[PDB]
């Protein structure tokens, strides 16, 4: 069942890349232009949006995708250069991909949670005391967040299955 | 008629992909900017738009297209990996494509219906009690929705015809 | 004269595709942003624009182009599948392309006419009784409409010439 | 000197295509948004802009470029179809290119003149009597218009030289 | 040092093309939208911007790049036509490239100077007498202008070195 | 360990290029539109933004990437020209790339520091005395700046390792 595992992993990676590159940019285009705070203080919108969304979801997902693909690029470069042994490099890159995927999943959970609330309570300068701000299309962003989390979890499960197939004794050496 | 069925299925899939990728993004570009609610409450436009359109039609159709194409990608990857038995994989991927197409059709019907009304009655916080909001180019979006439903139905019919051609006794094994 | 007819048909199809894909999107970009109605009623602009232009000319032309190209795609896919009788398929696709072109020409005439008036009289809710709206760059859109109609007419004439060359006794059989 | 003439003609055609496709779209992007009329009448801006610029320069130049390239496409398609006499087709396409280029140059002169005035005097409904409107970046558009006229004139001269090289008694037959 | 000279010239040309195509468009995107004049007179912003920046730097640089590359295109086309003596054409195109680069450098100096002031004093109709206008991101544009001047100067020096290597007694013949 | 060093250097360079080209443009899109100063003075926003961000981070990073890749382009062009000794050119380009990377890292540190403050105190004409301005999404820009600094540091370390592998006595000769 290793071959089906590799096929599924490749398919899921391509699926995630396509979904991000196609829709993520459009979904988060007006994230700040349509972010409005109930206030008259100049600069409160900027500060409140920055506090609410320190890093946009799309940027985080793009960075995650590139980082997770990086070990594959390392392996491909090594293979290309070798021609004008590789099993150890393959095992190492599998381990690194596992670690990177797990770390990115955990970071996404700890940074964004599982939903984007429609209201934000912002109490940052220059806003006077505490103000209420309203997010743009929170439901679509929540769906995107949950779907990306599910896809990353599937990738993590497939990578863990591949690692188990490789076996502990074989990564120890 | 299996060959003409496959030809028609491929043609319809390419047609749907082209139509989406070419016009869908432009049609739904100003969905939120031109969405206006008869109110003075800050943040009511965002909440009302989010309630009216939890997921944009274009995003749902893009996701549907990628998901429906996924089994073909799995089959192609399996074929590539095999070279440096496949009939069972072909039957399985045909079944999965049929199921995915039917599911996406049903989901589209249950999520969007058959028309996009020009008026929306929004009663979500912070809007005071009940307010009236006005949708951008509802007729074009209704035409797009109906056309996509028809194309998906044609795809479902072709997939069912292919499944019937394969026969129950072959998919059972 | 069949060969020159085919060459002219191909050239005209390519020319129409190029013109649309290059200038239509830019011409019809600010169709709604620059559409203004003389009124204070919120949501009257959206309703009046939707009534005036149920389907943008550019979307209709893109759909027409893809649909009229569809029979050629069907023929190409059939030819590819055959290699690892075709005259009948060629005749059938010629007939279908002729019918599609004629239908799209008639639909364009019945749906848009021959000009885009600079003034529109809109009496749709929520607009109070009757209001006057002003279209964006009506002259350029009128020129585009007339030019597209002329190109479609040339395509129809070429298709009819090809059909006449083929002969009724051969389409019947 | 026919070889150098053909080389110069090809280079000039490519140069014009590159210049248009690279800068023309950006130069005319804000043609309507930055067009302002000294009035309070709703819809007067749209009418005055439409009267001042019935067809954008960029659209006209794109149409001209495609049309002048069309005879070359016809020749290439004829050559492709011939393989699985051509001198007459070459002469005919050269004559047609000459006629098209001359006609487009004359049309540009009669439609746009040689400069884009910074002020426009607009007396079209709904504008109250006569109003003054101000064009966006008129100097850049004037420079672009003059440069395009010069390039088209160079193309016309080269095509006329090629025709003279071919000779009257040879086009006649 | 003719080989290293040619390599450096090619690298510098590619570098300039890349820098322009990548950043120049973005740098000058909001040149007019962010250009503001201290006045209430309608149309004063357009007139003052047109006077301050008759031709955008990016358009001038694009035109310069294409024109400077034109002799190379002529040489390549001549070489292609020759196959189904060239030293003279090479010398001629070297001379023409040198002349074009020098002319464009001189024109840039005489047209834009070496800096973009943050304030512009505009006294063109309809502005009343004399008004003050404020330029968008003048420092970035000044840096871009100086950098482009330096790159063009390097290109001019390399071309002059190549010409000196060729020798006057060889260009004369 | 030279081999893993080269592979890592190539992978990191590709990673930086991808990250910039994919997200940097979008992160810094509304840098000036969302820049707001607490004042009524016309033209104060432009001056304050220009003072706060003389050169956008994205432009600096693009310039750095192209300049750092330039030595590789020189080496490739030299290799191509030689075919229809190279070790010295390889060593020279390695030294130049190391120097360029170090210089760009130092320049980035001196020009931008390590964070983008959310508040800016601007006292440039025409702003009256001293005004407060609010930056757009400062946290995301700070994260991007720190990440780019880390990547550049990794590149510098790898280049220094390669230089040490080559040794002093080889670069000296």
Numbering used by the authors:
A (entry chain I), B (entry chain H), C (entry chain G), D (entry chain F), E (entry chain K), F (entry chain J): 19 to 102, 194 to 282
Direct quotes from the study:
Connexins (Cxs) assemble as hexameric hemichannels (HCs) that reach the cellular surface and dock with their counterparts on the neighboring cells, forming the gap junction channels (GJCs) and coupling cells metabolically and electrically. Pancreatic Cx36 plays a crucial role in insulin secretion, whereas in the brain Cx36 is involved in neuronal synchronization. Dysregulation of Cx36 is associated with epilepsy, traumatic brain injury, and ischemia, and elevated gap junction coupling in these conditions contributes to neuronal death. Three antimalarial drugs, mefloquine, quinine, and quinidine, specifically inhibit the Cx36 channel.
Cx36 with and without the drugs (1 mM) was analyzed by cryo-EM, yielding four reconstructions: Cx36–mefloquine (Cx36–mfq), Cx36–quinine (Cx36–quin), Cx36–quinidine (Cx36–quid) and apo-Cx36, at 2.14 Å, 2.73 Å, 2.9 Å, and 2.49 Å resolution, respectively. The overall protein conformations are nearly identical, similar to the recently published Cx36 structure. The N-terminal gating helix (NTH) is unresolved in our reconstructions. It is possible that in the detergent environment, the NTH is too dynamic to be captured by cryo-EM.
